[PDB]
Amino acid sequence: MAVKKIAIFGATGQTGLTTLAQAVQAGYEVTVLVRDSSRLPSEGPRPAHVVVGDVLQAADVDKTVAGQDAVIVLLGTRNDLSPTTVMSEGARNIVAAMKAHGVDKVVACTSAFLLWDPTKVPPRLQAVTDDHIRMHKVLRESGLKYVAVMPPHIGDQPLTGAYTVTLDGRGPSRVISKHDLGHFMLRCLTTDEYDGHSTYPSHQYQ
Amino acid sequence: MAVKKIAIFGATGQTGLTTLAQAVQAGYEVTVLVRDSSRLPSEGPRPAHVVVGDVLQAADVDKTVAGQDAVIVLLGTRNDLSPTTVMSEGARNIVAAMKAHGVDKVVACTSAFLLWDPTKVPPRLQAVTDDHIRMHKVLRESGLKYVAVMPPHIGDQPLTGAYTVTLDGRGPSRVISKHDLGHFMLRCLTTDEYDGHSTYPSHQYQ
Ligand SMILES: NC(=O)c1ccc[n+]([C@@H]2O[C@H](COP(=O)([O-])OP(=O)(O)OC[C@H]3O[C@@H](n4cnc5c(N)ncnc54)[C@H](OP(=O)(O)O)[C@@H]3O)[C@@H](O)[C@H]2O)c1
Ligand SMILES: NC(=O)c1ccc[n+]([C@@H]2O[C@H](COP(=O)([O-])OP(=O)(O)OC[C@H]3O[C@@H](n4cnc5c(N)ncnc54)[C@H](OP(=O)(O)O)[C@@H]3O)[C@@H](O)[C@H]2O)c1
Ligand SMILES: Cc1c(Nc2ncccc2C(=O)O)cccc1C(F)(F)F
Ligand SMILES: Cc1c(Nc2ncccc2C(=O)O)cccc1C(F)(F)F
């Protein structure tokens, strides 16, 4: 089940950047889909392959997923306060391409709001949560090996590797470092214990 | 006074009103952003400039921050404990305005709960705290000269100017008077020793 080639979607984001950096240092052959190349830092850890394109364009997604061993999805639309379907339409383009190229493993990040009561969502975050739910459906109904990662507040604490993962629930803390989050994303490429589960990562920092 | 023009956000609120009163008394030229339905009281001290608008509108925050030397943030939700992003989104707008207009100094109020063990946050206060956490992260990673003011319970005790300021930890009492809290927000304008630090003002009133 060895995973060497991965595609990262959302590589230029807050979590994406440290996931990409960790993935490149751990030996992964990384393909990233970016809309603008000047957002990848020109120093240190760089991906092996850059596809310049858009996750809503099925051609770009197919070019990105071709010949991978697994996909990591760290898509976000931080700015959208009103109904939005970019992530879920991106998931559809990813699901379809995974199927046409025979890639069976996807690890995708939504949010811990999908595990807590709906009344916990702040009004201005309801649209992205609604599309998070829509993307979770696309991936769950796809048949693929899909690890759902639903993190709480994403912090800037240093990497620890010591976080807890509670399977289909909510655990001790309400924070995961972006570094620890990307670590867990990459850890999910090395096991099947989270396949078809919802994972909540959190850790007590200092 | 090097600092003489300041914007106060949340000047109509419980701490903001006494902070506005002390700032005018101390000779500051104060600009306030007020929501249309909630103007400052009739008999109260008059600021030098009033912008009517909303902290969620980037245009109104830009109008308020332009031409200022420094910014004080005392936004809140009154006694409304509902999930919100008004403080974090507003801080996002304040951060953008300050960078555009060349304002560096922002003194912003979140809460002592960002210094304490997260397991101790009372569940009734977690939603508002989750936004203080979002707001603090916005301001922390802004790169601006940001004083994180993290008070415990806000009381109605007198202005003393004799409170303790604890750096990057919990202090010796669990209360600060709204008047002392506002005194400290203004004290932070006259010194750079707290820039980049978290600050916990507390006092014993007797
Ligand atoms: N902030 C939190 O505390 C928190 C908590 C729980 C869950 N989450 C969720 O976790 C996920 C990742 O979080 P994050 O903050 O790391 O994301 P982020 O910083 O907002 O980055 C979003 C990524 O998705 C890319 N993207 C957006 N639309 C795209 C499109 N049409 N085509 C290609 N790429 C696109 C972005 O590319 P560009 O650089 O071009 O924009 C970027 O790389 C998000 O969905 C977020 O809602 C966040
Ligand atoms: N024991 C405590 O009370 C305590 C302890 C620790 C920390 N804190 C936190 O300290 C901060 C200040 O506390 P406080 O009691 O002085 O505040 P407050 O009385 O709740 O006042 C909130 C201020 O922010 C304004 N505001 C709210 N939404 C706005 C919007 N969209 N646009 C523009 N202005 C808006 C409000 O204006 P309007 O008049 O229009 O409403 C008001 O002036 C709060 O964030 C609070 O959560 C409180
Ligand atoms: C901030 C955020 C979140 N945040 C959370 N999600 C789950 C649990 C806790 C939180 C939190 O913020 O504490 C979720 C989706 C999108 C967004 C963003 F960046 F777009 F605004
Ligand atoms: C009361 C409150 C607090 N309270 C505290 N915060 C920090 C430390 C101690 C306390 C306390 O009151 O014991 C925090 C945020 C918002 C709110 C409010 F007014 F909106 F309800």
SS (H, E, C) chain A: CCCCEEEEECCCCHHHHHHHHHHHHCCCEEEEEECCHHHCCCCCCCCCEEEECCCCCHHHHHHHHCCCCEEEECCCCCCCCCCCCHHHHHHHHHHHHHHHHCCCEEEEECCHHHCCCHHHCCHHHHHHHHHHHHHHHHHHCCCCEEEEECCCEEECCCCCCCCEEEECCCCCCCEEEHHHHHHHHHHHHHCCCCCCCEEEEECCCC
What single-letter DSSP state applies at residue B121? S
Q: Are strands B164-167 and B153-155 parallel, antiparallel or unpaired?
A: unpaired
Residue whose CB lies within 8 A of the most ligand 4 atoms, among B124, B133, B153, B174, for a mutation test: B153
Q: How far apart are CA A54 and CA B121, in angstroms?
A: 41
What type of residue is B153?
Answer: H
- Name the strands in the sheet holding B198-202, side by side, starting at the edge strand that comes first in the sequence: B49-52, B29-34, B5-9, B70-73, B105-109, B145-149, B198-202, B164-167
- For chain A, the structural domain boundaries read 1-206
Q: Which of B188, B194, B199, B200 is catalytic?
A: B188
Helices (H), chain B: 14-25, 58-65, 86-101, 126-140, 178-187
- Segment holding B77, helix H or strand E: none
Ligand-binding annotation for B35, yes or no, is yes
Top mutation candidate among A8, A9, A12, A36 for ligand 1, by most atoms within 8 Å of CB: A12
**Chain B residue with minimal CA distance to A78?**
B89
Closest by Cα among A29, A21, A23, A22 to A5: A29
Which residues in B lie closer than 8 A to residue A174 (C-beta atoms)? 118, 126, 130
Q: CB distance A120–B127 less than 8 Å?
A: yes
Out of A120, A156, A172, the one facing B83 most closely (by C-beta) is A120
Look-up of token digits 């048949």? A143
- Is residue B73 within 8 A of residue B10, CB to CB? The reply is yes
Q: Is A15 in the pocket of ligand 1 (CB under 6 A)?
A: yes
Nearest alpha carbon, ligand 2 atom 25: B10
In angstroms, this model's resolution equals 2.0
Q: Which of B120, B112, B105 is nearest to B194 (CA)?
A: B105
Reported as half-sphere exposure (CB side, CA atoms, 13 A), residue B116 has a value of 17
What CA–CA distances, in Å, run from A60 to A24, A31, B42, B201?
22, 12, 61, 54
Structure-token pair, residue A20: 């990409």
